[PDB]
Amino acid sequence: QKFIRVGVTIREK
Numbered sequence: 001q002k003f004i005r006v007g008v009t010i011r012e013k
Contacts, residue, residue, distance in 0.1 A: 001013065
């Protein structure tokens with residue numbers, strides 16, 4: 001937002 005999920009997730013945000 002990139003959601004992507006890696007349960008957990010990671011974003012540059």
